[PDB]
Ligand binder design. Structure first.
Ligand SMILES: [NH3+]OP(=O)(O)c1ccccc1
Ligand SMILES: O=P(O)(O)c1ccccc1
Ligand SMILES: [Ca+2]
Length: 534
C-alpha cells in the first residue's frame, strides 16, 4: 500500500523549544513522534517563511520558484525579475499537484504565504480541500485593527485573510484561534476522506509566529517559568542539548548579539512583560502540539499512523526581530500599537495584545548557532526536524546528516511511486528539483542523502551563504556584519565563530565559484539596500 503523508510546519519555532530537542515547553505529542522517529540536527530551510514554503512544495530553490525575496518587501530593481513574482510561479509544479494526479487526496489547513490571488491559492495549486490563512501572518484570534492609510505597513500586510477552497471567508467562527481552527479543519477533512485512498495532509501552523497569543489557561501553566530570563534559558537549553546528544559536549556557542538591554539591566515591569511574552510563546507551542496530537491520535485510532510518513519541521530560525526597528513596517508601529492594543502585563497573549519576544529570547532557542531568522548563518537556516515512519529502517536515532527542505518533494514522490515529470508539465517548461530523495538514506542503504561535495546556496535580504560538504561561507552586509565573506568549518565550529577566510583562502575561493554558479542557476538578484534598520 502507498503511504499517506503528514507534513507539519511550525512557524518561527526555534531549534531547542520542543521537549525532544532540549526544551522545557510541554510537547508530548511531538516528543513521541521525535523519539520514535529520526531527529535531524543538520536539516536546513531558507531564512524566512515564504522562501522556505516555496522550496518545501517544489524541491527547488526559492529564487526559481517565485519567492526570490519576500513579497512584502519587493523593491523596483527586483520587480519583474524571473522568480521574483512574490507568489509560487508557473515555472514550477507543486508536490500536491503531482500527488493529486496520482490518486492522492490533497488536504491543507494552515498558513499559505505563497499568494493572495484566486489563481495562487491552495485550491489553485493542487489541494482538493484547504482552509488557509493566505498572508504571512495575522491576529490568531481574528481581531483586526482599523485599516487605513496611516495603519503600519506590517499590519496592513497581515489581515486575517482566510479562504476555504475557492471561497474567501467573510467571517470567522466564534472562538476562532488559529492553531485550533487548523486542527479542527484538518481533522474534518481527514474524517471526511475516502478511506480507500491515501492522503497528503499539509499542516502549516501560524504559531508560534507573532503576535504572541494563546489561550489564557495554557499561558497560566508557564507562570513564573521564565523569570530568570533569556540568558538563563539559553544555558538550560545548551545543557540539555548536550545531555541529549543533539550537540557535542564541547561545542562553543556563538555569543548573543542584541541591541536591546540585557535582562539584569531591565526594570522590574519591563522584565515582567518580557517574561510574560515568553510564557505566551510557550503556550503557543504547547497548544500547537495539542492540535498535532488531535490529528495524530485520530490517524492512530484509524490504524493509519504507521502507514503515514510524518514530517515535522520549523520553517526558519527562531524570530529575533524587533519589528519596531524597521521603518518599512511603520510608520510609527509602536505608537499605533499603544493606541489600539493593550500590552500591559495582564493582557499580553490575548486577542487585543500585539507582542514579539525579540532577539534575546530568540537566541536562547537557536543556540549554539549564530543569530536567528532572516540571517543566512546557521541560526537562521538550521531548524528542528523529525521523520516518523516505521517502514524506514533509520528510526529511533539522532542524525547529524546534512539535509534540506528541497529534499522533501523528491522523497515524497519516491515513496508515492510517482516520477517527477521532468522539464515540462501541463505544457509549460518547469524546473526540476535541486534536492535529493532521502529514501536511500532513511532505508539504511546510505549514511546520508548528500556528501562532502554537495553544494547548496542561500541568498535573501542581501545576505548570502554557500556550503559544500561541511564547509560554509557566509556574507552578512552592514550594519549586521563585516560585508565580507567569512568561512567556517561547520564540523569543528557549528557556532560560526572562527573565520577561516585568511587561513584557508583556497577553500574560500572555491566556495565563491560555487556561489556564482548558484546565483547563475537560480536567478539571484541583489538590490541596492539589503534592508534598513533604524
Ligand atoms: N560555549 O558555553 P557555555 O558553557 O554554555 C557559556 C557559559 C557562560 C557564558 C557563555 C557560554
Ligand atoms: O517572513 P514572515 O513570515 O516573518 C512575514 C513577513 C511579512 C508579513 C508577514 C510575515
Ligand atoms: Ca516563519
Amino acid at each position: 500500500k502507498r503511504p499517506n503523508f503528514l507534513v507539519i510546519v511550525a512557524d518561527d519555532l526555534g531549534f531547542s523549544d520542543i521537549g525532544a530537542f532540549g526544551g522545557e515547553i510541554a510537547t508530548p505529542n511531538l516528543d513521541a513522534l521525535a523519539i520514535a522517529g529520526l531527529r535531524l540536527t543538520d536539516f536546513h530551510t531558507a531564512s524566512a517563511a515564504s522562501p522556505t514554503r516555496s522550496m518545501l512544495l517544489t524541491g527547488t530553490d526559492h529564487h526559481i520558484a517565485g519567492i526570490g525575496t519576500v513579497a512584502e518587501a519587493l523593491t523596483p530593481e527586483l520587480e519583474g525579475k524571473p522568480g521574483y513574482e512574490g507568489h509560487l510561479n508557473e515555472r514550477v509544479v507543486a508536490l500536491p499537484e503531482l500527488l493529486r494526479e496520482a490518486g492522492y487526496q490533497t488536504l491543507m489547513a494552515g498558513k499559505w504565504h505563497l499568494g493572495l490571488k484566486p489563481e495562487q491559492t491552495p485550491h489553485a495549486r493542487g489541494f482538493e480541500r484547504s482552509f488557509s490563512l493566505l498572508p504571512g501572518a495575522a491576529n490568531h484570534y481574528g481581531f483586526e485593527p482599523p485599516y487605513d492609510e496611516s495603519t503600519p505597513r506590517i499590519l496592513k500586510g497581515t489581515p486575517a485573510l482566510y479562504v476555504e477552497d475557492e471561497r474567501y471567508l467573510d467571517t470567522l467562527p466564534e472562538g476562532f484561534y488559529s492553531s485550533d481552527a487548523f486542527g479542527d479543519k484538518l481533522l474534518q477533512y481527514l474524517k471526511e476522506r475516502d478511506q480507500s485512498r491515501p492522503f497528503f495532509a499539509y499542516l502549516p501552523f501560524s504559531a508560534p509566529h507573532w503576535p504572541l497569543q494563546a489561550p489564557r489557561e495554557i499561558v497560566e501553566k508557564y507562570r513564573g517559568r521564565y523569570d530568570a530570563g533569556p540568558e538563563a534559558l539559553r544555558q538550560e537549553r545548551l545543557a540539555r542539548l548536550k545531555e541529549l546528544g543533539l550537540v557535542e559536549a564541547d561545542v562553543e556557542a556563538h555569543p548573543v548579539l542584541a541591541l536591546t538591554r540585557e535582562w539584569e539591566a531591565l526594570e522590574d515591569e519591563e522584565r515582567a512583560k518580557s517574561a510574560r511574552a515568553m510564557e505566551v510563546y510557550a503556550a503557543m507551542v504547547e497548544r500547537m502540539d495539542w492540535n498535532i496530537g488531535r490529528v495524530v491520535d485520530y490517524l492512530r485510532r484509524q490504524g493509519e499512523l504507521d502507514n503515514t510518513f510524518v514530517l515535522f519541521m520549523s520553517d526558519n530560525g527562531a524570530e529575533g526581530a524587533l519589528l519596531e526597528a524597521f521603518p518599512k513596517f511603520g510608520p510609527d508601529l509602536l505608537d499605533f500599537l499603544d493606541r489600539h492594543y493593550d500590552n500591559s502585563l495582564e493582557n499580553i497573549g490575548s486577542a487585543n495584545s500585539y507582542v514579539w519576544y525579540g532577539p534575546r529570547w530568540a537566541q536562547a532557542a537557536t543556540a549554539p548557532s549564530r543569530l536567528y531568522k532572516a540571517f543566512t548563518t546557521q541560526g537562521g537556516i538550521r531548524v528542528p526536524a523529525l521523520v516518523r515512519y516505521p517502514r524506514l529502517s533509520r528510526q529511533g536515532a539522532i542524525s547529524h546528516a546534512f539535509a534540506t527542505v528541497m529534499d522533501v518533494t523528491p522523497t515524497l514522490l519516491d515513496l508515492a511511486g510517482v516520477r517527477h515529470p521532468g522539464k515540462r508539465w501541463r505544457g509549460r517548461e518547469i524546473a526540476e528539483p535541486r534536492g535529493r530523495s532521502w529514501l536511500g538514506w532513511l532505508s539504511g542503504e546510505t549514511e546520508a542523502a548528500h556528501d562532502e561535495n554537495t553544494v547548496t546556496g542561500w541568498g535573501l535580504f542581501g545576505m548570502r551563504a554557500i556550503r559544500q560538504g561541511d564547509w560554509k561561507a557566509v556574507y552578512l552586509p552592514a550594519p549586521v556584519g563585516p560585508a565580507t565573506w567569512q568561512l567556517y568549518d561547520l564540523a569543528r565550529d557549528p557556532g560560526e565563530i572562527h573565520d577561516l577566510a585568511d587561513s584557508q583562502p583556497g577553500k574560500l575561493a572555491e566556495l565563491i565559484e560555487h556561489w556564482k554558479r548558484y546565483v547563475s542557476d537560480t536567478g539571484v538578484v541583489e538590490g541596492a539596500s539589503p534592508f534598513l534598520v533604524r
